[PDB]
Structure 1
Amino acid sequence: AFRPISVFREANEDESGFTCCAFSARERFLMLGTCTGQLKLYNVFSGQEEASYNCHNSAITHLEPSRDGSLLLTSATWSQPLSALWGMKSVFDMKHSFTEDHYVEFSKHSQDRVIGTKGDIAHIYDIQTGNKLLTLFNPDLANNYKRNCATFNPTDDLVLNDGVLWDVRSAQAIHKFDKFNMNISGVFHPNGLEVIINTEIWDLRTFHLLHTVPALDQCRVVFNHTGTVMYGAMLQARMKSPFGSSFRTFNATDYKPIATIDVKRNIFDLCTDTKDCYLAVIENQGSMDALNMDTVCRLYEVG
C-alpha cells in the first residue's frame, strides 16, 4: 500500500511549477526542477523550501544527482545548452554543458562519464574535461526510435542506444535488438543480465528473448535502489505532462505485476529515496488541457 505521507508545492508561486525530482544525498531533502528552469531543495516532510538555484532559461525536464553529492545533471526544453553538469561542492556552479543533448545520464559504477542523447545519437563525455569522447551512431543498425534515451549498463562496459548494444571500449556495435515498437529504446536491468526494451526482455549474453511483459508498453521505467521493484509509467502520446495518470509496479526478479496505481492526475516524474522507504511523485493538480500547470509533490511510504 502506497500510503500518503506529505504533499507540498512550489512555495508562494501563484502556479506551482515542479517538473522533476530526485532525492539529494541528505535525508529528508528532495531536489526538484521547475518549469522556469530552477533547481529547488525542499524538506519533503515539512514541505518547506530550503534553497533555489538558477539552471536554465526553460523548463527542466529531468535531473540526476551523482551518488556522492558532488555533481548534478539537468536537461531542459528549449535552452542552449540543452543539458548541463553542475558542481555542488562549496558553490553551485556550471562545470560543463552539453549543448545539443536533450537527455543526459551518469555512468553507473564509476560516475566519471556522462552519456547524452540527441535523437537516435549517443554522445559520451568525460566529466573532468567535458570533452566528447565518442559519438555512437551506426546507420546500418539504427532502429530510429522516436523516444530514444541512451544509457550505460551497470558496469559501464556497454551502452544501449536506439536498441543497439555498443562495446564502449572498442566503440563498436555488437548487436541490434529487433524492433517491436515506434518509441521506447530500452534500459538495462540492474541485475546486469537482461535488457528491457519496451515489452521485450532480452538475455544480454545470448540475445534470446526471455519474456514478454505487455503492461510495459510505452513505459519509462525506474528501479528502486535495492533492485527489487520496477516502476513503469506510460508516456502520453509550454511543457505537457510526459506521463498519464497511472504507474505500475513489477517484481524485478520475475517481472510479475504487483500494483497498478491511478493517481487521477497527470504524472511528471517519480523517484525513490536512497533507502527505498518512500516514493515522491510530481502530479499536476490542474491539466495542461486547460493550460493549467500547478503541480504538487506527493510523498508516499512504500508498503
Structure 2
Amino acid sequence: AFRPISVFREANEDESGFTCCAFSARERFLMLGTCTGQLKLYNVFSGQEEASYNCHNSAITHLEPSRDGSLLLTSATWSQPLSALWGMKSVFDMKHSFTEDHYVEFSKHSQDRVIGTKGDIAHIYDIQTGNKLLTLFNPDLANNYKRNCATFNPTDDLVLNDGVLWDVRSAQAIHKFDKFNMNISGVFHPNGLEVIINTEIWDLRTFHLLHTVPALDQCRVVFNHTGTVMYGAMLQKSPFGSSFRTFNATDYKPIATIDVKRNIFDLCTDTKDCYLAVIENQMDALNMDTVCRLYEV
C-alpha cells in the first residue's frame, strides 16, 4: 500500500507554499522549494523546519541535489536566472546559473555536467567552469514537444532531447524517435537499454518499438533508486492532477493507482526507497496551501 506516515506544512506561514521536494544526503531530512523562491530543510518525521535559504525571486518549480551532497540544482518560474547551481559545503552559495533554461538535471554516472532545457533546445554545461559546452538542436529532427525536458542516459554518453537521441562525444543526432504525442519527450530507463517516450517503449540498440503502455500518457516519470518501481503522474497552478501510478520497472506491468484527491506538485523517494514524499495542495483549489505527506512504500 501507500500508508500515510506523517504530514507537515511550511511552518508559521498563513499559506504553506511548498512546491517541490527531494531527499537530502541526511536520511531524515527533506529539501523543499517554495512558491516564494526559498529552499527549506525539514525533518520529515517531526515535520519541523531546520534551515532556510534564499534561491530565487519566484516560485521554485523543481530541484535536484547531487548524490554527494555538495551541489543543488534549482529551477524557478520567472526569475533571471531561471535555473541555478548551488554549492552546499561550508556556505550555501550560487556557483553558476543557467539564464533561460527552465529545467536542469545533473549527468547521471559522473555528476560533472548539467543539462538544461529551453523549449526544444538542450544546453550542456560544465559544473567546474559553468561554461556552456554544447547546444543540442537539429531543425531536421525536432519533434517540438511542448513539455520537452532533456536528459542524460545512465552512462552519460547519450542525451535525449525532444525525442532525439544525441551522441554527446561527437555532438551528433543519431536517431529521431517518431512522434506520437504533443507534450512528453521521454526519459531513459535506468537499465540503459530502453527509452520511455510517453506511451512508447523503444529499444536503444535497434530503435524498435518494444511495448506500448497507455497508462503512461502525459506522465512525468521517476524511478526508485533501485530501479524496480516507476512512478508516473499525469500532467494537468499545480503541474499534476490528483493521481499517480506505479509500474514494475522490469516488465512495465501496472502495480497501483493512487488518487490523493488533491492536486500534486511533486513526488520523491528517499535513497533507501522506503518512503515517498508527496506535495499536495489542500480539487483545483485557487488557494495555495500545500502540505508534504510522507507515505510508506
TM interval, shorter chain, is over 0.9
State TM-score, norm by structure 2: 0.99
Distance between the aligned counterparts of 1:210 and 1:98, measured in 2? 36
Distance between the aligned counterparts of 1:149 and 1:19, measured in 2? 18
Q: Is the 8 A contact 2:81 2:97 kept in 1?
A: yes
Instruction: Check 1:290–1:215 CA distance in 2 against 1; reply closer, same or farther (3 A cut).
Output: closer
Distance between the aligned counterparts of 2:160 and 2:225, measured in 1? 20
* Partner deviation per Cα, 1:137-168 (whole Å, 9 max, x = no partner): 00000000000000000000000000000000
Distance between the aligned counterparts of 1:250 and 1:141, measured in 2? 31
Name stretches of at least 5 consecutive residues in structure 2 with no aligned partner. none
Instruction: Check 1:289–1:5 CA distance in 2 against 1; reply closer, same or farther (3 A cut).
Output: closer
Distance between the aligned counterparts of 2:101 and 2:157, measured in 1? 21
Distance between the aligned counterparts of 2:270 and 2:220, measured in 1? 18
What secondary structure does 1:215 align onto?
helix
Distance between the aligned counterparts of 1:141 and 1:291, measured in 2? 40
Distance between the aligned counterparts of 2:196 and 2:268, measured in 1? 19
Distance between the aligned counterparts of 1:186 and 1:265, measured in 2? 26
* Partner deviation per Cα, 1:159-215 (whole Å, 9 max, x = no partner): 000000000000000000000000000000000000000000000000000000000
Distance between the aligned counterparts of 2:39 and 2:111, measured in 1? 21
Task: Give the C-alpha shift of residue 289 in structure 1.
Answer: 4.5
Name stretches of at least 5 consecutive residues in structure 1 with no aligned partner. none
* Partner deviation per Cα, 1:14-54 (whole Å, 9 max, x = no partner): 00000000000001000000000000000000000000000
Distance between the aligned counterparts of 1:11 and 1:96, measured in 2? 30
Give the aligned partner of residue 285 of structure 2.
290
Instruction: Check 1:119–1:19 CA distance in 2 against 1; reply closer, same or farther (3 A cut).
Output: same
Distance between the aligned counterparts of 1:170 and 1:18, measured in 2? 41
Task: Give the C-alpha shift of residue 291 in structure 1.
Answer: 2.1
What secondary structure does 2:174 align onto?
strand
* Partner deviation per Cα, 1:265-287 (whole Å, 9 max, x = no partner): 000000000000000000000xx
Q: Which runs of 4+ in 1 moved over 4 A?
A: none
Task: Give the C-alpha shift of residue 252 in structure 1.
Answer: 0.1
Identity %: 100
Distance between the aligned counterparts of 1:291 and 1:77, measured in 2? 18
Distance between the aligned counterparts of 1:215 and 1:297, measured in 2? 25
* Partner deviation per Cα, 1:106-159 (whole Å, 9 max, x = no partner): 000000000000000000000000000000000000000000000000000000
Q: Is the 8 A contact 2:263 2:284 kept in 1?
A: no
Task: Give the C-alpha shift of residue 290 in structure 1.
Answer: 4.4
Distance between the aligned counterparts of 2:7 and 2:82, measured in 1? 30
Distance between the aligned counterparts of 1:276 and 1:187, measured in 2? 20
Distance between the aligned counterparts of 1:254 and 1:144, measured in 2? 29
Q: Is the 8 A contact 2:220 2:235 kept in 1?
A: yes
What secondary structure does 1:184 align onto?
coil
Give the aligned partner of residue 244 of structure 1.
241
Distance between the aligned counterparts of 1:291 and 1:155, measured in 2? 42
Root-mean-square deviation (CA, aligned residues, Å) is 0.6
* Partner deviation per Cα, 1:214-245 (whole Å, 9 max, x = no partner): 00000000000000000000000xxx100000
